[PDB]
Amino acid sequence: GLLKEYEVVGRKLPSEKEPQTPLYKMRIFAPDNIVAKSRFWYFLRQLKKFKKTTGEIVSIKQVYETSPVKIKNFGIWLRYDSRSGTHNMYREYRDLTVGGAVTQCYRDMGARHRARAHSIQIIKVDSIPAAKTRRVHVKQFHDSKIKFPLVQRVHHKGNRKLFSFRKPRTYFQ
Amino acid sequence: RKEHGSFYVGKRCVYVYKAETKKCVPQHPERKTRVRAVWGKVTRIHGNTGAVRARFNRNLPGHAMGHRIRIMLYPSRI
Amino acid sequence: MPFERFVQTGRIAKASAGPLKGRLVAIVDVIDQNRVLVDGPLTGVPRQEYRLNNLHLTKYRIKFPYTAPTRIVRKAWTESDLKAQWKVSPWSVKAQNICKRSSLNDFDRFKLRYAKRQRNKLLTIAFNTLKKRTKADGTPRVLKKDRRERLRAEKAKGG
Amino acid sequence: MRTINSNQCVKIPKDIKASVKARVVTITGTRGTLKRSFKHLALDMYMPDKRTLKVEKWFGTKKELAAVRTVCSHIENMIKGVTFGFQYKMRAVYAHFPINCVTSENNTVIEIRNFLGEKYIRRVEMAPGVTVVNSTAQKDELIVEGNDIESVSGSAALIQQSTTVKNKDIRKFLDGLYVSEKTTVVKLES
Amino acid sequence: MTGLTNRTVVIDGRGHLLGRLASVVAKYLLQGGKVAVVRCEELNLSGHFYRNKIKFLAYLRKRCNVNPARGPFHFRAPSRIFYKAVRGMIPHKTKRGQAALARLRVFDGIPSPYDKRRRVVVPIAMRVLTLRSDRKYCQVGRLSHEVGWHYQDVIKSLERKRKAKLRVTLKHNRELKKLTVKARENIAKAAEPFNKIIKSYGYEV
RNA sequence: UUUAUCAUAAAAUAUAACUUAUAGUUUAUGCAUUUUAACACAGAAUAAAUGUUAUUAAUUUGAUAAAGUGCUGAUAGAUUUAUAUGAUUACAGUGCGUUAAUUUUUCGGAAUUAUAUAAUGGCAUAAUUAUCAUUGAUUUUUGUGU
RNA sequence: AGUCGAAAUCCGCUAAGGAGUGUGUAACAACUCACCUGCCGAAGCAACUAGCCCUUAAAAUGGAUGGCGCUUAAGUUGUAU
RNA sequence: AUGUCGGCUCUUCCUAUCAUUGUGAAGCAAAAUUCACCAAGCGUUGGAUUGUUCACCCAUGCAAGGGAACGUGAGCUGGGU
RNA sequence: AACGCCUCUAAGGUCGUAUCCGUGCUGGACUGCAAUGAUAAAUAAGGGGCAAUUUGCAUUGUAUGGCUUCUAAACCAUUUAAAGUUUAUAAUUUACUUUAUAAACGACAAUGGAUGUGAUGCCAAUGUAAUUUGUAACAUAGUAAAUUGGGAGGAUCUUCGAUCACCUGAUGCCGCGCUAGUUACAUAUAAAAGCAUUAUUUAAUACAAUGACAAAGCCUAGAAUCAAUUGUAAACGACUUUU
């Protein structure tokens, strides 16, 4: 999908020896509503006793990050399992939206390390301003004025004629 | 692409070919009978790129593969 | 550096492959190798991001800061007077087969493609307009200088 | 990581006249012309309306921009190849048989013999526009002139790579013709 | 001529990739097609030469052992390196897909009328749309020479024959357009002439 | 969010002086001018761009639902000897027989009340069953008035 | 004798010289490193770790990602219509 | 009911290289040799005893590889069982 | 070079095997392809080509609703996904060569097309279709064509390849028929009542293609095989030979 962002809150349903059990919350990136509510329990079966049903999911909501046209560079903290090899990482991407730079992580982490997305865990995601971004492929996209004449298209192959007539001479200068 | 062949759906396509016989008169407007036509009707779209299926009257003998059928322009929405 | 199209703030780029086809946007910043920001106020496109493979580039830079809000791109977009010098850009006339040769109704076509016989029946009889070595005269031009007296003097026939 | 820019600018001096033309570089000076191409590396070569010339690579990966720092060093050899020339030297060490090398006109290739008291009269040609005359002013020395560095050097390793002693030891049979001096022809004295 | 398009579609093989031009042509030839691919010594193969050396040198050691004459006949032209492709992509064991290679004539060195007839480019199979920087390619020109094609310099001299008289037929035509642009002057006062075409074109005046 | 208004910040680049550098330039190795895509955060001023707070203009933004919302296109198909021993009829829909003004087109239409409801929804209030939480809210039985 | 191998063992000299670093150099000694500063001036050095690739990787008819062919893929991993 | 050892004859194929061609290394002075790489192109014998296969022995040889259809009985033979 | 340095390597050039590939050699798309020679009997009549064929019948193939046609005139001259391409200009120069200077194009809309790349037709009607419609007036433009000797010109398993296209000597006089525009005028045709018309979509006109007949002049007068022989050959055929 594209990994929207949620804030999912727990309960430990309130049995009589203790009413009002203490309401923990998470920050979950999942493609959909209901899979966000089951990451929550996989990440509750490590920190609190608390399973379903011994617990509840009190109000979650999908959140809609704050500035969708600022050009912030995210820095995510990560934990992932290899073939033999559960490892911490720390990765950085440039994106307008937070859930766009967690899904930027997955398709990159999954390619570069083979990393199937059930063995990746997000352990922090924050915007990191500048002059803290390490990660050389970010901090070359910093310096205004950035000239960069990569004459770029997809250059749609080829066009509406299969047997075209015109020999498309890319450069056009 | 599929918006192109979505134009022709419903048009009476015809497959036209020839035969040795006439065996028949000119009964309505003058008929020589050297030309055979199997009428049809385009039904739906097929490809993801503008090919198309058509159910005919009989069933297209498959040495007709690669030979021309004539999609008509009638019955026409505008 | 033959000063090609640069992706720089705000090099004015006309998009194709995506939903901003036919729109003249302005770059604002650079997100990626493959994406940019995009902000064209006068052409009607708010601040999106855009896949760089979809937008093609023109010869028009314009100066802002790279942190500019749209209102001052809009201030700059009119101040350097793009709107009048783009609809005369030397192959932005060749845009306008999009407004004239595209679909060119069949309340247009015949008239526009019947005069091509008018033009050509006056063009092929404008052939053998010959200088190349014959000159002079290439017999049987004893009869045809009478026909060629209707090119030169031309009173009345030859000659 | 497909980094953006890595450009070098060769510093063309006043006496030589260069031209990059669509990628091939034709540099004209004192000793001649060295018209050579780089239609395989695919940089963006450019004389920025000055004397100088600048290569430039956009979005090459890692191996690609290694090859920026060579084409700016191929060029400055073809600078020196046409103002000072490229001249190697050979010294022809031997143990008991004197290697009687010779060349002449024309027969400005070479004709060497008596390695190692073998009858095989070894003959080594030369690359075009490059000559061998035997060096005077020295016992058993040679001089390979020429402007193109690789048509000097490569044409002056053929005289080195044969002769080599075959089928025996090489740490005691040290005979052959080896390179001692890789010089200019003019600068500064010679 | 006249047909499902023409009775030919002439394709230049220059600068195209060997197997993407094959599966375009073997699909189009089953549509009822008639192509005629020329300059087959120019088809580019991907990978460098000692990749495709080895692969054509492995396809020729596949010969029958009982009697080698029955075994795979390994044709060594460039135009038969390509025609071998368009048989892997065609149902050649059927009476339908045997009439689909009998529309395919394939030539190498552009002869006899396919030198005046307009020949077209297949941009889906061009090299310099497909294959990256840094990536070496080959040509089937040198592959067939290094596997025994005895007519490489035959057709290179025949190319320079028809390259040479192309400059004679362009200098017939370069000045002839220069006559048309002078012939275009005398008609600007024809009657009301050009106005009806220029008001829909006008970008070429 | 965005556009927009606010107040200050604090100013990270862009218009906006003149260095130096660089080559190409002139004049006698320098100047004179020319491109600085060398371009001195090199300065002033501006963008109060950027930074802070706050509010919003057709109050701007999607997705997620529901409604017929308003349809336009096509496709294939259509049992039936319902008496060859049991409704073709209940439905609704058209064409004749109070009223009066209102309106509109004037050629139609057009609109209008009281005509009898329990009234159901709305409001107020009483009333009680029962409750998330309880200032309250949710009801429940209703009942009255409107 | 500073020096195959050293018990020791500091220091003096001094920005920087140690009972001392070097050729399978038995003495002195020659001789050079360590070191510092000159020089240039932006990042540099190393041990790991796991992706694809490689090497490892050797069988007898001719030959099999099923075939062709593919190499900004028509391969592999993550996804989308 | 698939003729069950071998040998003789005759093919081709494989490398897990004995020798030859091309090279690399050596505690490689020469000669002689050993190590390793690309390599299956041409070779890989005559005999005494034994039915055997490997076997050992004489002799040739600067220098005598190993194997595949348990190759091969309407090919032979019939020594072995 | 990366990696201020070294480095056979990353890009680039090289040296190089009894291997591999080819030549040389043996078989030959069994029956591939080119070149070539003859081309029948008769000589009364016939038979056999020339041949668009001229002369009709009559069919196929077709542009099939007059033409859902096409043209059988080009877009680099090592190559390179930024890569550069054209254009003048000045010099250079066989050459769009080379070089300089300046432009345009900014891998867009566009260019994958109609530059319909010697500039397509969609028609001479001056009522145009399943037939053609006539004549003046005025304006500019002003074609298309038909007869005689020398040269240069053109070959890739060919859609017709001893011919061939241009060009000069030169014969001659279409002065037959051009066309575009404006305006006038002269007729003829055309209508299948189907008012929810289609059907095994005829078919023409024309293009082209044979086919066969009575129709049309020209040209033409050879071989192979068997049988017999040979012995360069041989199981048999076959091959080599001879009248």
Kindly write down the DSSP assignment for every residue of A138-164, as one continuous string.
Answer: TTTS--SS-----------SS-S-SSB
d(CA E16, CA A164): 13
Question: Which residues contact residue A66 at a Cβ distance below 8 angstroms, ignoring those fewer than 6 apart?
Answer: none
CA angle A83, A87, A90 (to 5 degrees): 130
Tokens of E53: 């050396």
Sheet holding D179-184, edge to edge: D132-135, D141-144, D86-90, D179-184
Compute chain C's Rg from CA coordinates. 28
Cα dihedral D12, D16, D19, D20 in deg (nearest 10) = -40
Q: At what angle do helices E152-164 and E166-183 cross, to 10 degrees?
A: 30
In terms of Cβ atoms closer than 10 Å to its own Cβ (0-12, 13-18, 19+), residue D1 is exposed
d(CA B40, CA B12): 5
SS3 category, E20: helix
Distances C49 to A5, C30, C35, D39 between C-alpha atoms, Å: 20, 9, 7, 37
Q: What is the number of other CB atoms lying within 10 angstroms of the CB of residue E86? A: 24
Contact D159, D177 (CB under 8 A): yes
Q: At what angle do helices E20-28 and E78-88 cross, to 10 degrees?
A: 60
Task: Tell me the nearest-neighbour CA distance from D56 into chain A, angstroms.
Answer: 11
Asked if D171 CB < 7 A from strand H, the reply is yes
Residue contact B68–E31, C-beta within 8 A:
no
Contact D62, D6 (CB under 8 A): no
For residue E134, which of E54, E13, E49, E47 has the smallest C-alpha distance? E47
Strand G: which residues 48-67 of E lie within 7 A (CB)?
51, 58-59, 61-66
Distances C31 to A129, C11, C59, D93 between C-alpha atoms, Å: 14, 15, 22, 64
Cα B69 from chain centroid? 5
For residue E108, which of E155, E39, E156 has the smallest C-alpha distance? E39
Residue position matching structure tokens 């209901």: A34
d(CA C57, CA C16): 10
Q: What is the DSSP string of D43-100?
A: ---B--SSS-EEEEEES--SHHHHTHHHHHHHHHHHHHHHHT-EEEEE----SSS---
Cα dihedral sign, C2-C5-C11-C14: positive
SS3 category, E83: helix
Give the CA-to-C1' distance from C101 to I120 in angstroms: 19
Distances A106 to A78, A80, C60 between C-alpha atoms, Å: 11, 11, 37
SS3 category, A115: coil
Residue type, A147: K
Element (H or E) spanning E161, and its range?
Answer: helix E152-164
Cα C153 from chain centroid? 42
Residue position matching structure tokens 């070496």: E136
Residues on E contacting A at a C-beta cutoff of 8 Å: 9, 11, 24, 28, 118, 120-124, 126, 128-130
Question: Beta partners for A127?
Answer: A74
CA angle B25, B30, B36 (to 5 degrees): 75
d(CA D68, CA D73): 9
Tokens of A149: 């004449």
If you count them, how many residues does chain E have?
Answer: 205
Question: Which residues contact residue E75 at a Cβ distance below 8 angstroms, ignoring those fewer than 6 apart?
Answer: E81, E83, E84
Cα D114 from chain centroid? 27
Contact E90, E83 (CB under 8 A): no
Half-sphere exposure in the Cβ direction for D37 (13 Å, CA): 3
Tokens of A155: 């250059």
Contact D164, D49 (CB under 8 A): no
Tokens of D97: 């048989």
CA angle A52, A54, A56 (to 5 degrees): 70
Tokens of C91: 């192959």
Q: How was this structure determined?
A: cryo-EM
Question: Beta partners for A89?
Answer: A78
Give the CA-to-C1' distance from D155 to I12 in angstroms: 16
Q: What is the number of other CB atoms lying within 10 angstroms of the CB of residue D40? A: 8
Residue type, A156: H
Cα dihedral D161, D164, D166, D168 in deg (nearest 10) = -140
Contact D25, D45 (CB under 8 A): yes
Tokens of E7: 């009775």
Name the closest nucleotide to E84, judged by C1' and CA. G68
In terms of Cβ atoms closer than 10 Å to its own Cβ (0-12, 13-18, 19+), residue D177 is buried
Asked if E113 CB < 7 A from strand I, the reply is yes
Cα dihedral E44, E50, E51, E57 in deg (nearest 10) = 100
Contact A75, A90 (CB under 8 A): yes
Backbone phi, then psi, for A28, in 5-degree steps?
-120, 135
Give the CA-to-C1' distance from C105 to I137 in angstroms: 38
D-chain CB neighbours of A137 within 8 Å are 1
Residue type, E34: K
| Resolution of the model in angstroms | 3.5
If you count them, how many residues does chain D have?
Answer: 190
Please note each residue after which chain D is broken, C-to-N distance over 2.5 A, or write none.
none
d(CA E145, CA C78): 63
Half-sphere exposure in the Cβ direction for D12 (13 Å, CA): 23
d(CA E17, CA E159): 21
Give the bases of strand I that a protein CB approaches within 7 Å.
1-3, 10-14, 20-23, 60-64, 69-85, 96, 98-102, 104-123, 130, 140-147, 154-159, 167-168, 170-175, 178-182, 192, 198-203
Give the 3-state DSSP-derived string for chain C, with helices as H, strands as E and coil as C.
Answer: CCCCCCCCCCCEEEECCCCCCCCEEECCCECCCCEEEEEECCCCEEEEEEEHHHEEEEEECCCCCCCCCHHHHHHHHHHCCHHHHHCCCCCCCHHHHCCCCCCCCCCCHHHHHHHHHHHHHCCHHHCCCCCCCCCCCCCCHHHHHHHHCCCCCCCCCCC
Question: Beta partners for C48?
Answer: C38
Cα diameter, chain E:
83
d(CA D24, CA D35): 7
Backbone phi, then psi, for C124, in 5-degree steps?
-70, -30
Compute chain D's Rg from CA coordinates. 20
Give the CA-to-C1' distance from E66 to H9 in angstroms: 20
d(CA E77, CA E154): 12
- Nearest chain D residue to C7 by CA: give it: D4
d(CA D87, CA D190): 9
SS3 category, A108: helix
Q: Which residues of A44-53 are buried (b: 16+ CB within 10 A; e: fewer)?
A: beeeeebeee
* DSSP symbol at B7: S
Question: Which residues contact residue E89 at a Cβ distance below 8 angstroms, ignoring those fewer than 6 apart?
Answer: E22, E23, E26, E27
Residue type, E196: K
Backbone phi, then psi, for E120, in 5-degree steps?
-120, 165
For residue C32, which of A73, A3, A153, A129 has the smallest C-alpha distance? A73
Give the 3-state DSSP-derived string for C22-33, with helices as H, strands as E and coil as C.
Answer: CCEEECCCECCC
Question: Beta partners for E106?
Answer: E37
Strands (E), B1-78: 13-18, 35-45, 52-56, 69-71
Q: What is the number of other CB atoms lying within 10 angstroms of the CB of residue C76? A: 18
d(CA B45, CA B51): 6
Residue position matching structure tokens 């060119």: C104
Contact C39, C50 (CB under 8 A): no
Tokens of A140: 């070359």
d(CA C38, CA C50): 6
d(CA E61, CA E72): 9
Half-sphere exposure in the Cβ direction for E131 (13 Å, CA): 20
Contact A138, A96 (CB under 8 A): no
Residue contact E133–D64, C-beta within 8 A:
yes
SS3 category, D173: coil
Tokens of D14: 């006043």
SS3 category, E79: helix
Tokens of B30: 């003058």
Residue position matching structure tokens 């990256």: E132
d(CA A127, CA A100): 12
For residue D159, which of D101, D85, D86 has the smallest C-alpha distance? D101
Question: Which residues contact residue D125 at a Cβ distance below 8 angstroms, ignoring those fewer than 6 apart?
Answer: D109, D110, D155, D158
Task: Confirm or reject contact between E31 and chain D (CB < 8 A).
Answer: no
Contact D121, D111 (CB under 8 A): yes
Question: Beta partners for A71?
Answer: none
Contact A10, A44 (CB under 8 A): yes
Question: Which residues contact residue C63 at a Cβ distance below 8 angstroms, ignoring those fewer than 6 apart?
Answer: C10, C76, C80
For chains D and E, count residue pairs whose Cβ atoms are closer than 8 Å: 7
d(CA E153, CA E145): 10
Distances D177 to B30, D116, D156 between C-alpha atoms, Å: 101, 12, 10
In terms of Cβ atoms closer than 10 Å to its own Cβ (0-12, 13-18, 19+), residue C119 is middle
Sheet holding E105-106, edge to edge: E105-106, E36-38, E10-12, E119-120
Give the bases of strand G that a protein CB approaches within 7 Å.
49-52, 61-63, 67-74, 76-80
Contact B72, B12 (CB under 8 A): yes
Contact A152, C53 (CB under 8 A): yes
Task: Indicate the pairing of strand B69-71 with strand B13-18.
Answer: antiparallel
d(CA E172, CA E166): 10
* DSSP symbol at E174: H
Tokens of E199: 């008001």
For residue B3, which of B47, B68, B53, B55 has the smallest C-alpha distance? B47
